[PDB]
Amino acid sequence: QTVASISSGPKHTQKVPILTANETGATMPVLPSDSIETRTTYMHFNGSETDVECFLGRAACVHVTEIQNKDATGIDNHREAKLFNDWKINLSSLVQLRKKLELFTYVRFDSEYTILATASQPDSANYSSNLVVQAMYVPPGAPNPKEWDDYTWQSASNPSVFFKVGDTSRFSVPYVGLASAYNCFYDGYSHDDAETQYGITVLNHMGSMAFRIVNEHDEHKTLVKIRVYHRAKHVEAWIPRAPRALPYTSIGRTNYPKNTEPVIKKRKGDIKSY
Amino acid sequence: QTVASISSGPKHTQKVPILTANETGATMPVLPSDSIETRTTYMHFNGSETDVECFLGRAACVHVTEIQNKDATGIDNHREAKLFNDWKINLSSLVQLRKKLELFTYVRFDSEYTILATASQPDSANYSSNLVVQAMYVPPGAPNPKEWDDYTWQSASNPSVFFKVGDTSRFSVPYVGLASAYNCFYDGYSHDDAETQYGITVLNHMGSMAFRIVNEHDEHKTLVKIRVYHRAKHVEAWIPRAPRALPYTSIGRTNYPKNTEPVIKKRKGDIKSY
Amino acid sequence: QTVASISSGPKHTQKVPILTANETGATMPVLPSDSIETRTTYMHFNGSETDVECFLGR
Amino acid sequence: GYSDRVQQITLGNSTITTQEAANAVVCYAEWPEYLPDVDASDVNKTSKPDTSVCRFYTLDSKTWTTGSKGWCWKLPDALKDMGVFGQNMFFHSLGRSGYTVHVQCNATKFHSGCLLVVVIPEHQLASHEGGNVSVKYTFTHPGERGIDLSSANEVGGPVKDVIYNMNGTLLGNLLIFPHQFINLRTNNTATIVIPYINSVPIDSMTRHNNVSLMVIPIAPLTVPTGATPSLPITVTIAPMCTEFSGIRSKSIVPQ
Amino acid sequence: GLPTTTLPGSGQFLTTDDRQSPSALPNYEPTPRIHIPGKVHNLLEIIQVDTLIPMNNTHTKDEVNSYLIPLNANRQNEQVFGTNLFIGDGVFKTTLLGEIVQYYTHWSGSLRFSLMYTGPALSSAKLILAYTPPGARGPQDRREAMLGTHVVWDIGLQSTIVMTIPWTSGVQFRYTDPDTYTSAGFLSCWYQTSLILPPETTGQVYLLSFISACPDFKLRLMKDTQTISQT
Amino acid sequence: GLPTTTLPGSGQFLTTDDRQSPSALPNYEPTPRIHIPGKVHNLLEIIQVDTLIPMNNTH
Amino acid sequence: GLPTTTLPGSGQFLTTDDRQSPSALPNYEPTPRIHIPGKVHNLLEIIQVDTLIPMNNTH
Amino acid sequence: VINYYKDAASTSSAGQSLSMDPSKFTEPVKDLMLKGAPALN
Amino acid sequence: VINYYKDAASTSSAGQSLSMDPSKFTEPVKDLMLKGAPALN
Amino acid sequence: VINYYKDAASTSSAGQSLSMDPSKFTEPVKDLMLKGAPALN
Numbered sequence A, B: 001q002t003v004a005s006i007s008s009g010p011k012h013t014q015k016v017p018i019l020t021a022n023e024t025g026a027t028m029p030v031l032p033s034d035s036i037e038t039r040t041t042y043m044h045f046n047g048s049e050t051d052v053e054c055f056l057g058r059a060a061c062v063h064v065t066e067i068q069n070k071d072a073t074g075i076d077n078h079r080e081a082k083l084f085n086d087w088k089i090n091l092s093s094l095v096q097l098r099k100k101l102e103l104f105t106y107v108r109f110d111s112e113y114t115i116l117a118t119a120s121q122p123d124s125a126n127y128s129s130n131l132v133v134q135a136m137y138v139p140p141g142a143p144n145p146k147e148w149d150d151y152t153w154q155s156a157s158n159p160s161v162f163f164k165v166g167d168t169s170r171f172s173v174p175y176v177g178l179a180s181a182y183n184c185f186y187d188g189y190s191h192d193d194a195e196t197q198y199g200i201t202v203l204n205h206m207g208s209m210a211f212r213i214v215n216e217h218d219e220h221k222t223l224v225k226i227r228v229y230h231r232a233k234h235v236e237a238w239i240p241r242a243p244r245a246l247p248y249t250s251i252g253r254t255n256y257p258k259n260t261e262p263v264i265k266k267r268k269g270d271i272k273s274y
Numbered sequence C: 001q002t003v004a005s006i007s008s009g010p011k012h013t014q015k016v017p018i019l020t021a022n023e024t025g026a027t028m029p030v031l032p033s034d035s036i037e038t039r040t041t042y043m044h045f046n047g048s049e050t051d052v053e054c055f056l057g058r
Numbered sequence D: 001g002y003s004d005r006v007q008q009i010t011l012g013n014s015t016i017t018t019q020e021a022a023n024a025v026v027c028y029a030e031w032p033e034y035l036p037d038v039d040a041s042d043v044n045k046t047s048k049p050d051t052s053v054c055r056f057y058t059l060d061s062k063t064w065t066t067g068s069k070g071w072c073w074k075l076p077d078a079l080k081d082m083g084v085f086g087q088n089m090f091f092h093s094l095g096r097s098g099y100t101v102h103v104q105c106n107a108t109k110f111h112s113g114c115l116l117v118v119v120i121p122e123h124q125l126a127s128h129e130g131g132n133v134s135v136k137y138t139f140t141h142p143g144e145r146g147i148d149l150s151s152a153n154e155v156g157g158p159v160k161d162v163i164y165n166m167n168g169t170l171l172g173n174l175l176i177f178p179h180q181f182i183n184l185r186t187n188n189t190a191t192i193v194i195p196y197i198n199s200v201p202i203d204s205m206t207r208h209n210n211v212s213l214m215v216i217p218i219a220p221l222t223v224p225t226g227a228t229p230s231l232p233i234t235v236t237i238a239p240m241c242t243e244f245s246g247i248r249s250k251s252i253v254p255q
Numbered sequence E: 001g002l003p004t005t006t007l008p009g010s011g012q013f014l015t016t017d018d019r020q021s022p023s024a025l026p027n028y029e030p031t032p033r034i035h036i037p038g039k040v041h042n043l044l045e046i047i048q049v050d051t052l053i054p055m056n057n058t059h060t061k062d063e064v065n066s067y068l069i070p071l072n073a074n075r076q077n078e079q080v081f082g083t084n085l086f087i088g089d090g091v092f093k094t095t096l097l098g099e100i101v102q103y104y105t106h107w108s109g110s111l112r113f114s115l116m117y118t119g120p121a122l123s124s125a126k127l128i129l130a131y132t133p134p135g136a137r138g139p140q141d142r143r144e145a146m147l148g149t150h151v152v153w154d155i156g157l158q159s160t161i162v163m164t165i166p167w168t169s170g171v172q173f174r175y176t177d178p179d180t181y182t183s184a185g186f187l188s189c190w191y192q193t194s195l196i197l198p199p200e201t202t203g204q205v206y207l208l209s210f211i212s213a214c215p216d217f218k219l220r221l222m223k224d225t226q227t228i229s230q231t
Numbered sequence F, G: 001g002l003p004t005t006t007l008p009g010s011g012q013f014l015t016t017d018d019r020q021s022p023s024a025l026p027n028y029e030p031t032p033r034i035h036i037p038g039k040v041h042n043l044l045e046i047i048q049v050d051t052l053i054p055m056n057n058t059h
Numbered sequence H, I, J: 001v002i003n004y005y006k007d008a009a010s011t012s013s014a015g016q017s018l019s020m021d022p023s024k025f026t027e028p029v030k031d032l033m034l035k036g037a038p039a040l041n
């Protein structure tokens, strides 16, 4: 099919393809056949695995949180006791997927979530309880749960999923951005104010995901850890940028740590060392 | 496809579209293009998510109840001991779905129920029992269970579902109203009597759903909590009304609490405050 | 589809459909339209739920 | 030459005229009609008194003062003692009907005031006692006197805070129901045509009120300097496409 | 037996899924449909009907007066009322529009705001309604207001003025829940000339304000509302 | 192997469902039908036959 | 009920699989696409653009 | 409606008979009796 | 979209109505009112 | 490839774009530059 290199022989002309001027801002498509004698070879390659659809198309962990099943008697702040918990939806908490997404400026896609819940009984327990988890999506404007047993968990309009601990939850969500694409970066503010926040933290008000355990308490305490995975599908990306070099310090902002190790390796020897 | 706004320019005529008379009872379809110069824009929107089929088309919790597996020896009133329990079918016990349904006067649809049962062993137990729940529908006129082991649970004609605790039960039910639609409101009585009940409580005699645990008792006591979810499908709605403003006080009646907080927010300042 | 009741008006004849003799052992198919003035109405019903297949079918 | 302002309505041997109306409302854009065979269930041949019941009946005038809260009538209740219509209501097991409601209130170009005139289908009232108390039959069947929203509560009766529409919903959204306004500076009358609205083909006319009519002052009444601080409000209702079914002995109702 | 592989998610109950399920009442024949007026197919149909706005929500408790906007005689260029345009909160929160809007996360489109004069027929007045698109503060005087979208209303035979609030935004959707990035701007009303009453007239004059949506309107991402609770 | 996702309700026994099930007696040949008078197809057939009412249930 | 046999692997979550899944937001209508310059389809597109090499990384 | 099993007993419910003739019970008389005519002539 | 069950109630959601006529609520007046013409003539 | 679900978001991955045009990044110059010809003429 496609040729990787054409057959090219000796050369002696005034057409010098290897002499350019990089200050123009262009990367002239020079080939090996332009500076050496080559033979014919074929690609036998389409580059399907480097398509943005494939690059962002696999599940990556985007959040880990914890909730627990125990007696709620006396507990004043259920949220703090972790009788139920929150997740202010965002994809820049765990760095692996974040660096990939931030290889672009604007990004548009549907999301496929997979939520894994694992039980743990650190203290004395006679058996492993069979708990059912309820993950409810709380869009901005919806009433937030205050107690693991609010009226809010009725979830009449909020979408929510019920699944066994140890099992996995799965569903997809359409592209919910308010604009035509999501912003990986935002050089702006919410309004013209002297103190207001800067960055995409201003655009990322996606709401929360409330997690709880439907079962009443058992004699012992059970610790359920929840892991949320995200896979993008039907991907579109715009304006590629320089890859993240320094470590992250916060969700949403480009801030980097003070006093960080150099990122570029230093030669063990000369600039002439191999 | 559809235009959201047509292109409209300067105006100077005797045709004043923005001067109306709201006492006629009509809401004249005035558009931005009737009072300002506009450009052409398209809808790129069908409003599929606001279709009544979609609005009432998702599962909402409509009831929570409890039953338990324990030694029945000596217990005189099985129903009270919760060896088995009842649910006088109704959809106005939990307010979230209720407010939605009450956005209309008459409503017709098929119902898809999903019943979740979760176990709990508050006291000392050596293991988590593997209990099977039996939910039997008892239509008005059918004999009610008196003991968790009546002949009634034979359920020869009553439809009933058997499922494991921790698992979920699912099935749909056709529109069972006696009339052409269900009433969300009823300005009437069962007959012309001075003391008889008022409201839809008169029309809502849908029967009961009896829940029990088929297993005999184990050494310990197990508490099973049952949650019933309702999703409407093949929806039809008539006569939209004012949304519920004040909190509810009872199943079926429009009653509201004495001494309730004002519903309308009070300005922090003037009527001129932004 | 099927009519539940036909339209029937006043009556004055020697054909008395409501006078029978139950000792014959028969249950003459008398209808409301045989003893009162009726309007037209339809069944909108097939009786599928009372079919023996359904009755013993659960 | 014609205008929404001037109108005539003739039903039976009764005719009302107005020279200061604001069009007229036909609930959900549907004119009343008789019950078609395809929708019928009751096999009894119905009775259509026509002109003897489909005519205008005028209720006692209310008095709008600077402190009025509003009034609420219910149909067919409000006409239970009105000529032949009323008689048919009690002598029959079933019946259905539509109406033409005409509310009247005139003042001068110096007065100011704005009445909301609305028709609410299935207006299930709430008990002022809260909890799960019911509202006794008598209290939702006031007859032509209707319910006065500025009167005090009474044991077994409904709550009457104009603000919560007697049912736990806010006054401001009453406009989602077929309505009209009588704004003294524009209006003189309000007219609403009501078609039969129910989840059944025909019903009991005594144990169930299909709609309630409310006349609520929004912008309070104000009269010119030194004038009588009140104006009368008159309600005239005419049934239409009325059908009665299942005639038997006369019904006896609570009190 | 057909070889299968169950995927993650198996067994889950997604309150939003839409699948088939066995009928618990086989062969049941539901009651025939009959005609019932006023059928509703989409919530976007009903939010186009306007309802009263409790603009004057300056009272100690809820009351009819909350809907009455006071207008004063012989006042000149002064402000009549003001409000931001967070339709899912403030004065709008209890209105039919606000109530329905709160059942969804996103909104877009144009709003229909109207005012009906109730003062005596022999009185006169000229007011000016103004919409101030996001980016600047709510106008503090008529001049500031008049510089943006506005309508000069002449009270007369036609009692109601209908000012549309044209969809003015960069991002094509705003949040119903009050959010700064997606703020909609401000609405204000001022005296163009003044309110004039006739002889023998001293009573207070009021305005009734209504709010509804234009066919322009769109709502997305259904969610639970903060307008009801128990538990 | 065909990818599948089990829906809620899986495993339940709804006394009212109407599905297929394997036969425990494969190849069994049931007895031939013979004519029997008085076949009933619908309960609505028989309630049209009248029976005596114990009107004077005063004993 | 169609007879089936579940194969090994059933229940697993392979971060790399690519199957269908139910939408948690049915009938939601995403925002219209508008034109945005600089669209990238494949990473092989961008590695053809050259960047500076820190050759003298002797600091 | 694809039958996965080999035997007839395996198939699901039969579906409405749609015969409905009550006369073999309501009118099992030898001499036909016409509604309206003298039961005993 | 193959229906596995015999009854209609078993089938999934209906899909968008695609009717959308608000006029029975926004303009339930007897005499037609044209936008631009005097509301009260 | 039978879509079991009603919404587009439910469907699986899109499959290779097969567009692959790097020039908008490698050669975003106003005046076309031919390989072999003087970069700066």
Ligand SMILES: COc1cc(CC(=O)c2ccc(C#N)cc2)c([N+](=O)[O-])cc1OC
Pocket (backbone or CB within 6 Å): A089, A091, A111, A113, A137, A159, A173, A176, A182, A183, A206, A209, G024, G025
């Ligand atoms: C499964 O948990 C959910 C997650 C989300 C958030 C979402 O899909 C998203 C993805 C990427 C970006 C970017 N950049 C912003 C938001 C939504 N949601 O936004 O509606 C709902 C969820 O459960 C219905």
Ligand SMILES: COc1cc(CC(=O)c2ccc(C#N)cc2)c([N+](=O)[O-])cc1OC
Pocket (backbone or CB within 6 Å): B089, B091, B111, B113, B137, B159, B173, B176, B182, B183, B206, B209, E024, E025
């Ligand atoms: C799953 O539990 C059941 C529930 C019901 C009640 C029902 O479907 C219903 C829905 C809405 C309205 C209104 N408004 C009234 C009744 C019935 N049932 O009525 O027969 C059977 C059930 O198990 C066979």
